[PDB]
Amino acid sequence: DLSHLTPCSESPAYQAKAKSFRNTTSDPESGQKRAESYAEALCGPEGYPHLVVDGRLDHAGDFIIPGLLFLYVAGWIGWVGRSYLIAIREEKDTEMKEIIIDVPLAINKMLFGFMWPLQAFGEFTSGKLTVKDSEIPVSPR
Amino acid sequence: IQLTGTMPKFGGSTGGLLSAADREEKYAITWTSKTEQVFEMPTGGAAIMNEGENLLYFARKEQCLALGTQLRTKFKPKIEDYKIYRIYPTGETQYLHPADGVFPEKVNEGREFHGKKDRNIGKNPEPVTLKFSGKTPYD
Amino acid sequence: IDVVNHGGDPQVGNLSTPINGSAFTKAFINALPAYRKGLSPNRRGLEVGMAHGYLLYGPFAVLGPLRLTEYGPTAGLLATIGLVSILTICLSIYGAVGVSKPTETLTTPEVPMDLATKEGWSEFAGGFLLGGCGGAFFAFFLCQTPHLQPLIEVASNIWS
Amino acid sequence: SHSVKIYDTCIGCTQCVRACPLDVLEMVPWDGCKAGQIASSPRTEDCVGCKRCETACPTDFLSIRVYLGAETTRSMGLAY
Amino acid sequence: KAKVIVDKDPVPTSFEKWGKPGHFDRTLARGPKTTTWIWNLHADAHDFDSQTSDLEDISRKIFSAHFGHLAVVFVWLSGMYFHGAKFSNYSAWLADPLNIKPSAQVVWPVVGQDILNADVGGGFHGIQITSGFFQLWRASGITNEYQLYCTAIGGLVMAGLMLFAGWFHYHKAAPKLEWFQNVESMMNHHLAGLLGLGSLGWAGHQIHVSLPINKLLDAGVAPNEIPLPHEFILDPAKMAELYPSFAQGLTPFFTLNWGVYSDFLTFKGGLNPVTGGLWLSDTAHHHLAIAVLFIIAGHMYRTNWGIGHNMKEILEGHKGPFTGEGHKGLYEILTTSWHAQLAINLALLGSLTIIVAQHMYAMPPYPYLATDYGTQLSIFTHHMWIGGFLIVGAGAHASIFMVRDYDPAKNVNNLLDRVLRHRDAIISHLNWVCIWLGFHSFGLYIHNDTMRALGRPQDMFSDSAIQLQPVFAQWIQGLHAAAAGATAPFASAGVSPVFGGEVVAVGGKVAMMPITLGTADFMVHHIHAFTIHVTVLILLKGVLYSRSSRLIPDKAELGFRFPCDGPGRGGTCQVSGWDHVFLGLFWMYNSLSIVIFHFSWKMQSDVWGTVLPDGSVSHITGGNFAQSAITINGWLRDFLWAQAANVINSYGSALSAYGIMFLAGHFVFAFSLMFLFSGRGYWQELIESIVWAHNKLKLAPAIQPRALSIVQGRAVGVAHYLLGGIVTTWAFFLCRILSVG
Amino acid sequence: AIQRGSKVRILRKESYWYKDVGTVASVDKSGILYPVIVRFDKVNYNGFSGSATGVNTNNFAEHELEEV
Amino acid sequence: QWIKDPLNVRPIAHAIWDPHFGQGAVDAFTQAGASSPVNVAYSGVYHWFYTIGMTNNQDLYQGAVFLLILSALF
Ligand code: CLA
Ligand code: CLA
Ligand code: CLA
Ligand code: CLA
Ligand SMILES: CC1=C(/C=C/C(C)=C/C=C/C(C)=C/C=C/C=C(C)/C=C/C=C(C)/C=C/C2=C(C)CCCC2(C)C)C(C)(C)CCC1
Ligand code: SF4
Ligand code: SF4
Ligand code: SF4
């Protein structure tokens, strides 16, 4: 239940720090906005917010939402890269547009890269995502 | 045998023969040229190929063939007639580089198979087969 | 006029510069105990050891842990004796391994044939021992007997 | 002395012999190649081990292969 | 003999080659099969000799690339003047230069970097700059920010003009080869026309602009009632009310009555007591004197009219018995090889930049330069680093000359041939003097560590212990302190307060003190000589053994930049001339780090500090160089541990970016050792393991991933090493001196 | 079945393109050990350090191959 | 001395005999209640010996002699 971690509003070390939060942007009340926004976290004896990473809810915003957001964005980047790499193979001049990127193909790969997990599941169930161990270069033992 | 040759006009350097040349072995290169030109010694600096036939001494075989490569390439008269010898301090001379009289990159009859394996390099025995013996897996 | 020539053989890796072999360095290197014509070993070693033992009582006598103490000259003598003994052990084992004929250069066209054998280098080592002990003791006696000798005040005021 | 071993996957391009700086290698006639020649290493006691012959070999794995073994005064390439 | 001849439109201006990378090399044009193509694209982009074999095309490329480099430098200079004009407190700094720090860069508040805007005075928040631009503009007579804005606009116009000239001299009218061979005309126009006319124009500016504006500034007039420099020329009455010898005209110049110009052309020598800089009358007189000397020197060489020298008979006549033939062949070397010219020019520019560093600290040329310790420390450190880099590049290009441009046919029995012939005697005696200097410069520190550790303070090499007083340098200091009035009878003071005299102090801080040299200075100067000598040993060994050695005799055919010849001959690793530059970069790092450490400790302990009202000087550290700069533990404790208390406690303050850069440089130094210690064959096999995992998911790249080459691995390692160490020392120095200075 | 232009997979373990598919440039009909010249899309490691080029063809035997 | 006050007395590993010490190092390394330059033990075998049953120096001496006999036996 994390009795050692108190909420930052009830913690009497966070309230001493929260007066002297510096402004980060040009907004004059940015320190006060940070102070009110970090009060819902858990603070230790230092008076600083802590993040609990075990997938629980009311602390899913620490890791689960940023983690799923990164997984979507990184899957977007990797899937668009893999799609471009596959698309530039079977047209007999691949190093030149590996080094000088074909922009009209890359734009069509990028803007249609939002549906990366559906295409990933389709290629996984279709077997066209993973190359079989026979048709692949392997170093000598 | 006895190496009839005159030395190129060289000013003398510090990269030449050391004490082991007169005690272990030294090497010589003799070459005939029909013109007088300037060459670079592996010893260091530049010397003069005088008209006629030349004899130089070096401490290593690699210095002699580094000179012989400079005699073959990079010269317009295209000197190939060079011979490389080894002189031991006893006095014995061994004629080394053009043994058949032809350069090794040109094939010649009378040369036998040395170091030739009638097997693929991947088809080599494992060292675990050849444990505790003098034989190594490339034999 | 080329004052820097070869030694007579250009393809040998050396040059006959004024410092190397001109007129005054061929002599005085051929006239040192090593490379002198008439000396035997245990005489070359005697001269070399005497010079070395005499010079080595300079950075031990006034430069040591005891140099502010009256035992300082005696400790410098003992340190010189110890260094001469270590160098004699080094010479003895160098000979006992087995020596070759010494390197002939432009400065020294003739090297001592008597130092090309193990027996000659043993005589050289014994002469070095006796010479080093004698030179160290002579320098100790000279530095100690006036008990101040203000030449030692020079280069100890420098090495304060 | 090093061991320069020439294997039977040799196309006889003579690049190893021209790349060799101490005349270790030469060409011998050979019936098992299109070029009619294979490399041989007779005076392999002069091999320093620079592997310039292994650098110049155009086979997928090298038909000429240098094994660094016992070190002599010629394998070290010492002028002294 | 010297005429202008060009080719009209030799290279068309088209964008078709912009989209074809690797066009300059034949090997780079086949296409990127491996990732080594990408690194070879940048490694050989500027190597114009490997691109074309014609020296005329190479010289044309070099001449047109110089204009692009000058355009880049002019964009940089215009950016600095624009930052002074728009984002600086220069107008605030001119009012109160003793309590307002120079700042010329504000930081945008998007994250918590708004703390990086230091409170420097005058209601301005920004980064305290240490470049010395503010003192330079005060010495230039710049009073308002509009004069900086005009100079920034002029810098942009000049940068565009240089870009247009670079396009013009490669695509419209490109000079021939013999337009470059006549170095006689080039050197005459660089001595008289560039250095001579440039210093004459600056002497005229310092007469007409810098001197009256700076005399009114030192007299106590606020800069916005100070008249603009153009009514000093338009109205000579205001110019002649101060320094009243402008009442008479230019005729005493032409009747050789130069003495009446002595009020504004002085030879005072010392520092200005008001500002702490050199007298601007001394600088104007200096620029006039060297302008006349450079213009005279620019009439030495024969160009078109018979009078002059040809720089060949000078070389032909210089020959002795120890050399024989002499300098014959050197004119052809320096007129056919660009690399020999770069090796000479880069060495002299590096030693020149080191001279600039060693001179501007002792004789500060600018008002309030010595007062701001951060500016002085930063310009000294920056110019040492630039100078050492240029010296190592000179060693590099000498090595590139020896295998790519040296011809043994033109060099028989001259100086270069004989240097190659006794290179063993050169390198072995240099090796001996490096070993001797290492023992008798570092073993003194080791002995001092040992006797200070063993409780033997009387057995050390100290001022209280066995002394090692530098009697020659102290004698030279005594000669310079007594030089004014005895050997320089018309100097008011010495050239610098370093050699003697009194404490020159401005405000409450010391401008300069006498710098007494003791045992610690002797020992650290011998370490300076040692490290310089080892850098010379590595670079000169790379130069002399560039073509051949006893190990690899056929090393010129391998090239300047090759990794090795193989594991044979014991292993011929790092035999090339490039790898000696690679090691000499580490040794210049070591050398110049010890130089700037000696500077940053000696000036902080014995020169810099505050002046008590009694008259004594309380220094920054407290004069601990006499007793702690003799031990490595003293250098670790009283210099590195003690003075880095500012860079590590800088977090949450205005200098926290320096602590960030301190840690970042530590990271990059540690990151360098992955490339420096490891080798290519590990990483190629690791990339082979990664390629299979890409092949498993159809992620095989067309350009096959290779590990970095051995030379590129060494280059990446040494660049990261130098970057991480230099950033660390920059951060440590600047955060220390922005807290204690 | 081995003919010029046929795509074929390498069975030499030590080859760079082990279990990789390349085309046939020429097959030699004389009695030599490795008659099938096979050219690949990728390039070998071969070359000096820093060399951007490499070989992409080699001779192979009949038993060292399989037709796809 | 250490078994009387294990929390205050510093354990001594061995004595120092150095010809290179000055007076300052002899005075500095004369520690842990000794009259000689000694080294302070940081391996902590003193705690081990006190725990396993060693009380006096004779029980350590007989253990050292027994270990010498065991090493000779091996
Ligand atoms: C299409 C691009 C792409 C894809 C999807 C992959 C995917 C893979 N890589 Mg990666 N990688 C790539 C490019 C790519 N990489 C590049 C450019 C580099 C060189 C820096 C590497 C070097 C590399 C290493 C060293 C390792 C991986 C690993 C892996 C695996 C785990 C993911 C990971 O660790 O990411 C790590 C990703 C990086 C370190 C760099 C990725 C760079 C960007 C994000 C790639 C996408 C941008 C691309 C340049 C342009 C897209 C094309 C566009 C024009 C449409 C996974 C199979 C690991 C593995 O084998 O796990 C099984 C492994 O150890 N990769
Ligand atoms: C990486 C390159 C680099 C960088 C970024 C800078 C940057 C800096 N330099 Mg620097 N410099 C360098 C290389 C570098 N320099 C080199 C290679 C030299 C040797 C020529 C110098 C010599 C130099 C001097 C002498 C001074 C600067 C100063 C400055 C600072 C202000 C810039 C300015 O406007 O000064 C403007 C300064 C001037 C216009 C005076 C320079 C006039 C010189 C004496 C004439 C040189 C003529 C010619 C170009 C060189 C010919 C060489 C000859 C042997 C043939 C700044 C920190 C100044 C400074 O520290 O002020 C606080 C300063 O006075 N630098
Ligand atoms: C007037 C100056 C001058 C000139 C123009 C030359 C000219 C040249 N040099 Mg160089 N050189 C010099 C100074 C000079 N150099 C100095 C100062 C060094 C000492 C380090 C050397 C050392 C040297 C060597 C060792 C070699 C050359 C070579 C080259 C040639 C091609 C350069 C190239 O394409 O590489 C372009 C490569 C780069 C631009 C990469 C540089 C990467 C640096 C480390 C980054 C810059 C530092 C920066 C502040 C880091 C910021 C990090 C941040 C972005 C995160 C060309 C002849 C090469 C040659 O001729 O090959 C045969 C060669 O190998 N140079
Ligand atoms: C602290 C680090 C360190 C040390 C000790 C050395 C040591 C050495 N470097 Mg350097 N170097 C280093 C790091 C180091 N380097 C790294 C990082 C690189 C950069 C890549 C290299 C690369 C390098 C090159 C490229 C070169 C050297 C050379 C040298 C030598 C200079 C000669 C000298 O000073 O002799 C004196 C020795 C010292 C000052 C070391 C301290 C020894 C003390 C003073 C004496 C103690 C001995 C002791 C009493 C013996 C008795 C003990 C007994 C039990 C055995 C020396 C052996 C140069 C060389 O060999 O030519 C001369 C040279 O060419 N260095
Ligand atoms: C000349 C010359 C030189 C040299 C110098 C020197 C180096 C010197 C040294 C010197 C020395 C270094 C000396 C020494 C001396 C020694 C001696 C003098 C010894 C003696 C001894 C003795 C006599 C002893 C005895 C004894 C004995 C034997 C035993 C018993 C005891 C006794 C002790 C008695 C030079 C090079 C510059 C060059 C020029 C010239
Ligand atoms: S390793 Fe070098 S010397 Fe030996 S055979 Fe190969 S190329 Fe010749
Ligand atoms: S380099 Fe290799 S393939 Fe070419 S001839 Fe020599 S061994 Fe045969
Ligand atoms: S380890 Fe690398 S640099 Fe050294 S010899 Fe082998 S390949 Fe060359």
PDB file of N, CA and C in Angstrom, chain E residues 434-456:
ATOM      1  N   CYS E 434      63.595  13.151 -24.715  1.00  0.00           N
ATOM      2  CA  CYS E 434      62.273  12.928 -24.141  1.00  0.00           C
ATOM      3  C   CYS E 434      62.339  12.078 -22.881  1.00  0.00           C
ATOM      4  N   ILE E 435      63.156  11.021 -22.890  1.00  0.00           N
ATOM      5  CA  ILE E 435      63.314  10.177 -21.707  1.00  0.00           C
ATOM      6  C   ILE E 435      63.987  10.946 -20.574  1.00  0.00           C
ATOM      7  N   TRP E 436      65.029  11.723 -20.897  1.00  0.00           N
ATOM      8  CA  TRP E 436      65.716  12.535 -19.898  1.00  0.00           C
ATOM      9  C   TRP E 436      64.786  13.571 -19.294  1.00  0.00           C
ATOM     10  N   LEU E 437      64.015  14.255 -20.134  1.00  0.00           N
ATOM     11  CA  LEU E 437      63.091  15.264 -19.653  1.00  0.00           C
ATOM     12  C   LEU E 437      61.976  14.652 -18.828  1.00  0.00           C
ATOM     13  N   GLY E 438      61.494  13.470 -19.218  1.00  0.00           N
ATOM     14  CA  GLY E 438      60.499  12.781 -18.422  1.00  0.00           C
ATOM     15  C   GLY E 438      60.995  12.395 -17.057  1.00  0.00           C
ATOM     16  N   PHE E 439      62.201  11.833 -16.983  1.00  0.00           N
ATOM     17  CA  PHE E 439      62.774  11.494 -15.689  1.00  0.00           C
ATOM     18  C   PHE E 439      63.024  12.736 -14.844  1.00  0.00           C
ATOM     19  N   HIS E 440      63.736  13.726 -15.370  1.00  0.00           N
ATOM     20  CA  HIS E 440      64.138  14.873 -14.570  1.00  0.00           C
ATOM     21  C   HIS E 440      63.130  16.009 -14.604  1.00  0.00           C
ATOM     22  N   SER E 441      61.897  15.734 -15.008  1.00  0.00           N
ATOM     23  CA  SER E 441      60.796  16.655 -14.792  1.00  0.00           C
ATOM     24  C   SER E 441      59.659  16.007 -14.026  1.00  0.00           C
ATOM     25  N   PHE E 442      59.414  14.709 -14.234  1.00  0.00           N
ATOM     26  CA  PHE E 442      58.325  14.040 -13.549  1.00  0.00           C
ATOM     27  C   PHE E 442      58.805  13.260 -12.338  1.00  0.00           C
ATOM     28  N   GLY E 443      60.001  12.669 -12.386  1.00  0.00           N
ATOM     29  CA  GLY E 443      60.555  12.037 -11.212  1.00  0.00           C
ATOM     30  C   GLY E 443      60.899  13.004 -10.106  1.00  0.00           C
ATOM     31  N   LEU E 444      61.081  14.289 -10.424  1.00  0.00           N
ATOM     32  CA  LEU E 444      61.122  15.297  -9.371  1.00  0.00           C
ATOM     33  C   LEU E 444      59.794  15.375  -8.634  1.00  0.00           C
ATOM     34  N   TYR E 445      58.681  15.323  -9.366  1.00  0.00           N
ATOM     35  CA  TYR E 445      57.365  15.304  -8.735  1.00  0.00           C
ATOM     36  C   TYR E 445      57.128  14.003  -7.980  1.00  0.00           C
ATOM     37  N   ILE E 446      57.614  12.885  -8.521  1.00  0.00           N
ATOM     38  CA  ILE E 446      57.467  11.589  -7.855  1.00  0.00           C
ATOM     39  C   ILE E 446      58.288  11.549  -6.571  1.00  0.00           C
ATOM     40  N   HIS E 447      59.517  12.068  -6.625  1.00  0.00           N
ATOM     41  CA  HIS E 447      60.362  12.202  -5.446  1.00  0.00           C
ATOM     42  C   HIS E 447      59.726  13.118  -4.416  1.00  0.00           C
ATOM     43  N   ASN E 448      59.113  14.213  -4.861  1.00  0.00           N
ATOM     44  CA  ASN E 448      58.463  15.121  -3.929  1.00  0.00           C
ATOM     45  C   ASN E 448      57.223  14.502  -3.298  1.00  0.00           C
ATOM     46  N   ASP E 449      56.448  13.731  -4.070  1.00  0.00           N
ATOM     47  CA  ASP E 449      55.350  12.943  -3.514  1.00  0.00           C
ATOM     48  C   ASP E 449      55.848  11.965  -2.470  1.00  0.00           C
ATOM     49  N   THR E 450      56.953  11.288  -2.767  1.00  0.00           N
ATOM     50  CA  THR E 450      57.471  10.274  -1.865  1.00  0.00           C
ATOM     51  C   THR E 450      57.983  10.897  -0.572  1.00  0.00           C
ATOM     52  N   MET E 451      58.792  11.956  -0.659  1.00  0.00           N
ATOM     53  CA  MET E 451      59.309  12.573   0.560  1.00  0.00           C
ATOM     54  C   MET E 451      58.247  13.337   1.337  1.00  0.00           C
ATOM     55  N   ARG E 452      57.245  13.911   0.674  1.00  0.00           N
ATOM     56  CA  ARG E 452      56.144  14.487   1.425  1.00  0.00           C
ATOM     57  C   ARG E 452      55.277  13.408   2.063  1.00  0.00           C
ATOM     58  N   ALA E 453      55.161  12.238   1.435  1.00  0.00           N
ATOM     59  CA  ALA E 453      54.433  11.119   2.014  1.00  0.00           C
ATOM     60  C   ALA E 453      55.196  10.452   3.150  1.00  0.00           C
ATOM     61  N   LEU E 454      56.518  10.340   3.033  1.00  0.00           N
ATOM     62  CA  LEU E 454      57.338   9.675   4.037  1.00  0.00           C
ATOM     63  C   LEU E 454      57.734  10.588   5.186  1.00  0.00           C
ATOM     64  N   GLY E 455      57.157  11.782   5.278  1.00  0.00           N
ATOM     65  CA  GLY E 455      57.496  12.704   6.342  1.00  0.00           C
ATOM     66  C   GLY E 455      58.901  13.253   6.244  1.00  0.00           C
ATOM     67  N   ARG E 456      59.332  13.581   5.028  1.00  0.00           N
ATOM     68  CA  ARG E 456      60.662  14.144   4.796  1.00  0.00           C
ATOM     69  C   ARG E 456      60.520  15.438   4.010  1.00  0.00           C
TER      70      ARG E 456
END
